[PDB]
């Protein structure tokens, strides 16, 4: 246990399917969505309903297809209101024998759905009520079904974290504190992350369980290695999502990996797609200008392409497995 270790509090990571090891998760993929709905697709079911059994025939294939590549863990990192759906990621870990854990959490105030807390907010101690839904679902489990989060997902907006917002990093850091589960984020535009890393430790969270997440956004180093002061990982999460309404394209994301991967931050660095496998709601369709956008967006990418790309450009196989099998044993395990 060299290095900067998690504070005694969590000892195994938690899935959908149960507990799991450290040393079983393997390579992880830290952030991704077996499936994910934009807040109102519910309210789209009678022409976008969800066909379980097409998605669930989507998703298995996608595991087998993770599975074949090495990679063993899965964090699915969709937020309470994304379509967050506890027993469909078990179905599909049952099925393939992926491990995948999931968050509890809730998103951004620009694309979550805001009004229920913001009305508990106006109401009364929202942070104590966000509080107590984080740590059930972490220390008990979700909907009544045992099965737990392993993961807390906070994130903020682009100008600020908002009031909104703080209500959920207030609470998180709470949790964190109680029980020593992991805290991953979004980040909007490449902005907050150091204000994030800041306000979380401040509060008292374990910087060594923290990642922040979507740094990919943001193509100043400096940046970057000013989120890292803080003792915190980060997570260069979209690879593959290029140029999609403001994104770094991936030869400006490895330009920035390399760089703080030859200033020896391989230990606090991540990798992952945000891919979406199966979306919620009416199928997505897809400009023609946008094609290229989401070419490379989906969960292969990284072993494929990113991974290779990196060692001939220099990078080690042991520091290709300290971000890929060596930070996620640490961080979620
Ligand atoms: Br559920
Ligand atoms: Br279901
Ligand atoms: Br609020
Ligand atoms: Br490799
Ligand atoms: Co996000
Ligand atoms: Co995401």
């Known amino acids: 246990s060299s290095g900067l270790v998690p504070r005694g509090s969590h000892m195994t990571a938690q899935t959908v399917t149960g507990a799991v090891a450290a040393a079983q998760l393997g390579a992880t993929l830290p952030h991704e969505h077996v499936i994910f709905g934009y807040p109102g697709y519910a309210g789209d079911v009678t022409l976008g309903p969800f066909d379980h059994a097409a998605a669930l025939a989507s998703c298995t294939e996608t595991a087998r297809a993770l599975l074949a590549r090495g990679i063993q863990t899965v964090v699915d990192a969709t937020p309470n209101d994304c379509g967050r759906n506890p027993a469909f990621l078990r179905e599909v870990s049952e099925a393939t024998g992926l491990q995948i854990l999931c968050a509890t959490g809730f998103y951004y105030e620009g694309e979550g759905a805001t009004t229920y807390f913001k009305f508990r907010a106006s109401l009364g101690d929202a942070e104590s009520e966000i509080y107590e839904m984080m740590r059930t679902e972490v220390t008990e489990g979700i909907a009544g079904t045992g099965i737990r989060a392993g993961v807390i997902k906070l994130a903020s907006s682009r100008d600020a974290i908002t009031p909104y917002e703080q209500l959920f990093f207030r609470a998180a850091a709470r949790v964190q504190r109680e029980t020593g589960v992991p805290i991953i984020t979004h980040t909007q535009e490449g902005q907050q992350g150091p204000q994030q890393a800041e306000l979380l430790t401040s509060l008292g969270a374990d910087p060594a369980r923290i990642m922040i997440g979507h740094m990919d956004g943001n193509t100043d180093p400096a940046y970057h290695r000013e989120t890292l002061r803080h003792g915190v990982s980060i997570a260069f999460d979209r690879i593959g999502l290029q140029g999609m309404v403001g994104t770094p394209t991936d030869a400006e994301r490895l330009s920035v990996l390399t760089t703080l991967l030859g200033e020896g931050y391989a230990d606090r660095l991540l990798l992952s797609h945000d891919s979406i496998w199966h979306w919620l709601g009416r199928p997505p369709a897809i400009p023609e200008a946008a094609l290229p956008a989401v070419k490379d967006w989906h969960p292969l ?24 099998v060596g930070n996620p044993a640490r961080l979620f395990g």
Do not use: K, W, Y
């Not at 072993?303 to 890929?324: C, N």
């Open 301 to 324: 990418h990284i072993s494929d392409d990113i991974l290779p790309d990196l060692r001939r450009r220099g990078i080690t196989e042991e520091q290709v497995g300290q971000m890929t």
